[model samples]
Target chain A: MQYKLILNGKTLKGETTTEAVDAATAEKVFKQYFNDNGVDGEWTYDDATKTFTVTE
Target chain B: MQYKLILNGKTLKGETTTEAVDAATAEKVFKQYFNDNGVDGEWTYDDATKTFTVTE
Candidate 1:
């Protein structure tokens, strides 16, 4: 499935494909992406929209 | 005077001292900082609080 990534209310990256079947698994991928980019924030994942949000 | 730098509602860098006596001059410094950091966003300056904001 494809997921959207939002950072601080702005689109950081979108159209991300992942193999995860649930929000919990998807969150791991999103959190790793933030960590790799040196970003720290509060994270949220919406299952219906497959959207990951990070608010700093 | 010292100024605060905010990015996406989060404090980026604070206590930055500059020779700018006006908002316009201070904006140049803030813009340069953004450019140097490879950040693209809408910029705003608050003269009353000497705060620079960048919203992406």
Candidate 2:
């Protein structure tokens, strides 16, 4: 199942992901590393499993 | 060999800094300039070089 996420930190990516919970939580999980250093917080049940897709 | 100084954009200030890379890379010769606009990277060598004792 999916859960809430609060992904944060990066090379100046602003807010990164906070309150902007969305799908691909798994994909992002791949492009990241969990060391309590970069990504902060855990997945919550109050978060969405799927979301809109918008890219530049 | 000093090289890390944020030339941040005005209007709104925020956490500004990235992976601490001291000294003039000799290659990347230039003070710090927030990339892609405002700050984002959760600096560390673990990035660590964030400071600013100033005010409006």
Candidate 3:
């Protein structure tokens, strides 16, 4: 399934085809991307919407 | 045709449906969005790709 990743009110990935095994795994991907890109923020993922949001 | 607006290597508008009369008008939209959002950067428009890139 596709997911949407929003960072600082901007849609970083409006539609990503990456499939996460579960919500936990999806959140991990979000944090990893943030950390890898030097993005300092708090993140949350909504399983229902498949949206990952990060606020810096 | 859709236009892509990229800011700081991030895709601000991956696919914008807004129709621009011409490249000049498209550039204006880019500058307005940047100024309205307080994004300071140098922007360039690629006519062929219909992409607007802004670097901070």
Candidate 4:
């Protein structure tokens, strides 16, 4: 899925997708993208919902 | 969609949420996350797959 977002005056969006993986692995994928391109935003995950979001 | 991911000892995962958009929008969402919680990795996108990934 795509989310409307912005950075350094650049309008953008992002998403996460893979095979049937647990939360730990899913988190790694999230961190990978975040640590680089979006490394200036706050992040949180919903254990119950199993969904994550970011804002920076 | 979910993928394996990690962060500063804090296991985290992220994904974008919204309607249809372009590459620029996707990049921003990914950037925002990295800028905040995962700011220590590299990022890239694949046009053929319309996917983005990160590493640190």
Candidate DockQ values, in order, are 0.03, 0.09, 0.07, 0.20
The estimated TM-scores of all candidates read 0.36, 0.23, 0.41, 0.36
For every candidate, give the share of true A-B contacts it also has.
0.00, 0.08, 0.00, 0.38
What's the residue-level lDDT of B11 in candidate 4?
35
Better TM-score candidate (2, 3): 3
The 10 consecutive residues of candidate 4 chain A with the worst lDDT sum are A1-10
Compared with the true structure, model 4 gives a TM-score of 0.36
Model 4 RMSD to the real structure? 10.9
Candidate 3, A1-56: lDDT as tens digits? 55677656232223333456777776776566565333455777788887876665
RMSD for each of the candidates: 10.6, 11.2, 9.1, 10.9
Q: Which stretches of model 4 miss by more than 4 angstroms? A: A1-10, B1-56
Using TM-score as the measure, which candidate wins?
A: 3
Over the stretch A1-56, how does candidate 1's per-residue lDDT look in tens digits? 65666566222322334546566767776676565343465777877887877765
TM-score of chain B of each: 0.56, 0.24, 0.62, 0.52
Q: Could you give candidate 4's per-residue lDDT for residues B1-56 as a string of tens digits?
A: 22222322223335443322666665555555565453445676554455556555
Candidate 1, residue A1: the lDDT equals 63
| Residues B1-56, model 3: lDDT tens digits | 44677656232323332446777776676566665334455777787787876765
**Compared with the true structure, what per-residue lDDT tens digits does model 2 show for residues B8-44?**
3332233333333443341132223232323333332
Docking class of 2: incorrect
Model 4: DockQ vs. true structure: 0.20
Query: Positional deviation of A45 in candidate 2, in angstroms?
Result: 25
- Tell me the TM-score of candidate 1's A chain: 0.58
lDDT of 3 at A25: 78
Q: Rate the local accuracy (lDDT) of all candidates.
A: 0.59, 0.31, 0.59, 0.47
